[PDB]
Short mmCIF file of all heavy atoms in Angstrom, two decimals:
data_model
loop_
_atom_site.label_atom_id
_atom_site.label_comp_id
_atom_site.label_asym_id
_atom_site.label_seq_id
_atom_site.Cartn_x
_atom_site.Cartn_y
_atom_site.Cartn_z
N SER A 108 -47.70 65.91 6.91
CA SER A 108 -49.17 65.94 6.87
C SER A 108 -49.70 67.36 6.99
O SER A 108 -49.27 68.14 7.87
CB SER A 108 -49.75 65.08 7.96
OG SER A 108 -51.18 65.18 7.97
N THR A 109 -50.60 67.73 6.09
CA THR A 109 -51.18 69.07 6.05
C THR A 109 -52.65 69.12 6.49
O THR A 109 -53.23 70.20 6.54
CB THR A 109 -51.05 69.68 4.66
OG1 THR A 109 -51.79 68.86 3.73
CG2 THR A 109 -49.58 69.69 4.22
N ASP A 110 -53.23 67.99 6.83
CA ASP A 110 -54.62 67.94 7.32
C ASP A 110 -54.68 66.95 8.49
O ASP A 110 -53.75 66.17 8.74
CB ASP A 110 -55.60 67.55 6.22
CG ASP A 110 -55.21 66.24 5.55
OD1 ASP A 110 -54.07 66.14 5.06
OD2 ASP A 110 -56.05 65.33 5.45
N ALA A 111 -55.80 67.04 9.23
CA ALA A 111 -55.93 66.18 10.43
C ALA A 111 -56.14 64.72 10.07
O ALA A 111 -55.56 63.84 10.72
CB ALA A 111 -57.12 66.71 11.29
N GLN A 112 -56.96 64.45 9.06
CA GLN A 112 -57.25 63.08 8.73
C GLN A 112 -56.00 62.29 8.25
O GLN A 112 -55.84 61.14 8.58
CB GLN A 112 -58.37 62.98 7.65
CG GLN A 112 -58.71 61.61 7.18
CD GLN A 112 -59.57 61.61 5.95
OE1 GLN A 112 -60.16 62.61 5.59
NE2 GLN A 112 -59.61 60.46 5.27
N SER A 113 -55.20 62.96 7.41
CA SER A 113 -53.95 62.31 6.94
C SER A 113 -53.02 62.08 8.11
O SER A 113 -52.38 61.01 8.17
CB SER A 113 -53.29 63.17 5.90
OG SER A 113 -54.14 63.37 4.72
N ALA A 114 -52.91 63.00 9.03
CA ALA A 114 -52.01 62.84 10.17
C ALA A 114 -52.53 61.69 11.07
O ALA A 114 -51.71 60.88 11.54
CB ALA A 114 -51.92 64.15 10.96
N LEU A 115 -53.84 61.69 11.35
CA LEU A 115 -54.38 60.65 12.21
C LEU A 115 -54.28 59.27 11.56
O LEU A 115 -54.05 58.30 12.28
CB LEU A 115 -55.84 61.00 12.54
CG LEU A 115 -56.02 61.82 13.81
CD1 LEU A 115 -57.40 62.37 13.93
CD2 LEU A 115 -55.68 60.94 15.03
N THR A 116 -54.45 59.17 10.27
CA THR A 116 -54.26 57.90 9.57
C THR A 116 -52.83 57.40 9.73
O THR A 116 -52.59 56.26 10.09
CB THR A 116 -54.65 58.03 8.10
OG1 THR A 116 -56.06 58.19 7.99
CG2 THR A 116 -54.25 56.79 7.34
N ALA A 117 -51.85 58.29 9.50
CA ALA A 117 -50.46 57.90 9.60
C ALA A 117 -50.12 57.59 11.07
O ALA A 117 -49.26 56.70 11.32
CB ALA A 117 -49.54 59.04 9.11
N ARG A 118 -50.74 58.25 12.04
CA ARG A 118 -50.47 57.96 13.43
C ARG A 118 -51.06 56.58 13.82
O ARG A 118 -50.38 55.82 14.52
CB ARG A 118 -51.02 59.05 14.34
CG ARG A 118 -50.43 59.02 15.73
CD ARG A 118 -51.50 59.09 16.83
NE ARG A 118 -50.90 58.78 18.14
CZ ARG A 118 -51.15 57.73 18.87
NH1 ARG A 118 -52.03 56.79 18.41
NH2 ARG A 118 -50.58 57.54 20.04
N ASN A 119 -52.30 56.33 13.43
CA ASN A 119 -52.90 55.03 13.73
C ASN A 119 -52.15 53.88 13.03
O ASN A 119 -52.13 52.76 13.52
CB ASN A 119 -54.36 55.01 13.30
CG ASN A 119 -55.17 56.03 14.10
OD1 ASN A 119 -54.73 56.53 15.16
ND2 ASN A 119 -56.36 56.33 13.57
N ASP A 120 -51.57 54.16 11.89
CA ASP A 120 -50.68 53.17 11.21
C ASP A 120 -49.52 52.79 12.11
O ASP A 120 -49.20 51.61 12.29
CB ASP A 120 -50.20 53.69 9.87
CG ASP A 120 -51.30 53.73 8.83
OD1 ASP A 120 -52.37 53.15 9.07
OD2 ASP A 120 -51.05 54.32 7.74
N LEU A 121 -48.87 53.80 12.68
CA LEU A 121 -47.73 53.53 13.62
C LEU A 121 -48.26 52.91 14.88
O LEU A 121 -47.63 51.93 15.40
CB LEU A 121 -47.00 54.83 13.91
CG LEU A 121 -46.04 55.33 12.84
CD1 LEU A 121 -45.40 56.63 13.26
CD2 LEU A 121 -44.97 54.25 12.59
N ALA A 122 -49.35 53.39 15.43
CA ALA A 122 -49.90 52.82 16.68
C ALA A 122 -50.25 51.35 16.47
O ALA A 122 -49.96 50.51 17.38
CB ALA A 122 -51.16 53.60 17.08
N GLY A 123 -50.89 50.96 15.34
CA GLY A 123 -51.19 49.58 15.09
C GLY A 123 -49.95 48.71 14.97
O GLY A 123 -49.94 47.59 15.48
N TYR A 124 -48.90 49.24 14.35
CA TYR A 124 -47.67 48.46 14.24
C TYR A 124 -46.99 48.29 15.59
O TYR A 124 -46.56 47.15 15.95
CB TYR A 124 -46.70 49.19 13.26
CG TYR A 124 -45.32 48.60 13.20
CD1 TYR A 124 -45.07 47.33 12.73
CD2 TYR A 124 -44.26 49.31 13.75
CE1 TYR A 124 -43.80 46.79 12.73
CE2 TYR A 124 -42.96 48.74 13.74
CZ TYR A 124 -42.77 47.52 13.24
OH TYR A 124 -41.49 46.96 13.22
N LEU A 125 -46.89 49.38 16.38
CA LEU A 125 -46.24 49.28 17.67
C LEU A 125 -47.03 48.43 18.64
O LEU A 125 -46.38 47.71 19.49
CB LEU A 125 -46.03 50.68 18.23
CG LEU A 125 -45.07 51.56 17.44
CD1 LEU A 125 -45.14 53.02 17.89
CD2 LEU A 125 -43.65 51.03 17.55
N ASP A 126 -48.35 48.43 18.57
CA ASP A 126 -49.15 47.59 19.45
C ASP A 126 -48.85 46.09 19.18
O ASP A 126 -48.75 45.31 20.17
CB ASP A 126 -50.62 47.88 19.27
CG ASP A 126 -51.50 47.11 20.24
OD1 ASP A 126 -51.61 47.54 21.43
OD2 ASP A 126 -52.04 46.05 19.86
N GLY A 127 -48.78 45.70 17.93
CA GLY A 127 -48.40 44.33 17.60
C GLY A 127 -46.99 44.00 18.01
O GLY A 127 -46.70 42.82 18.40
N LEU A 128 -46.09 44.97 17.99
CA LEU A 128 -44.71 44.74 18.46
C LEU A 128 -44.70 44.52 19.96
O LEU A 128 -43.92 43.72 20.47
CB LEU A 128 -43.85 45.92 18.10
CG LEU A 128 -42.33 45.79 18.28
CD1 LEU A 128 -41.83 44.61 17.49
CD2 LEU A 128 -41.61 47.08 17.88
N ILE A 129 -45.65 45.19 20.69
CA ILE A 129 -45.74 44.95 22.13
C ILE A 129 -46.16 43.50 22.38
O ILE A 129 -45.56 42.80 23.24
CB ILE A 129 -46.71 45.96 22.75
CG1 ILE A 129 -46.13 47.36 22.72
CG2 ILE A 129 -47.05 45.53 24.17
CD1 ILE A 129 -47.07 48.45 23.20
N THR A 130 -47.21 43.06 21.70
CA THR A 130 -47.68 41.68 21.82
C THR A 130 -46.53 40.70 21.45
O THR A 130 -46.39 39.67 22.12
CB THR A 130 -48.87 41.44 20.93
OG1 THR A 130 -49.96 42.33 21.33
CG2 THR A 130 -49.36 40.03 21.07
N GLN A 131 -45.75 41.03 20.44
CA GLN A 131 -44.61 40.21 20.05
C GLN A 131 -43.61 40.06 21.22
O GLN A 131 -43.08 38.99 21.47
CB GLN A 131 -43.93 40.73 18.80
CG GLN A 131 -42.77 39.89 18.33
CD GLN A 131 -43.21 38.60 17.64
OE1 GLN A 131 -42.98 37.51 18.18
NE2 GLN A 131 -43.85 38.72 16.47
N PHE A 132 -43.32 41.21 21.88
CA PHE A 132 -42.41 41.18 22.97
C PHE A 132 -42.97 40.46 24.19
O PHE A 132 -42.22 39.88 24.99
CB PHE A 132 -42.03 42.61 23.39
CG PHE A 132 -40.99 43.18 22.53
CD1 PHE A 132 -40.95 44.57 22.29
CD2 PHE A 132 -40.01 42.42 21.94
CE1 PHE A 132 -39.96 45.11 21.48
CE2 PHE A 132 -39.03 42.96 21.12
CZ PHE A 132 -39.01 44.31 20.91
#
């Protein structure tokens, strides 16, 4: 990622996935 918005989008993508994995556990 070369800009803030692209990095934050990719980070929130991971955060959303991991949060659902927490609920799954």
Side-chain angles (χ1 to χ4, degrees):
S108 177
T109 62
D110 52 308
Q112 177 192 343
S113 299
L115 269 166
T116 291
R118 196 229 170 248
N119 298 342
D120 288 350
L121 282 178
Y124 170 69
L125 295 168
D126 185 80
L128 192 57
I129 291 174
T130 301
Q131 181 74 249
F132 279 150

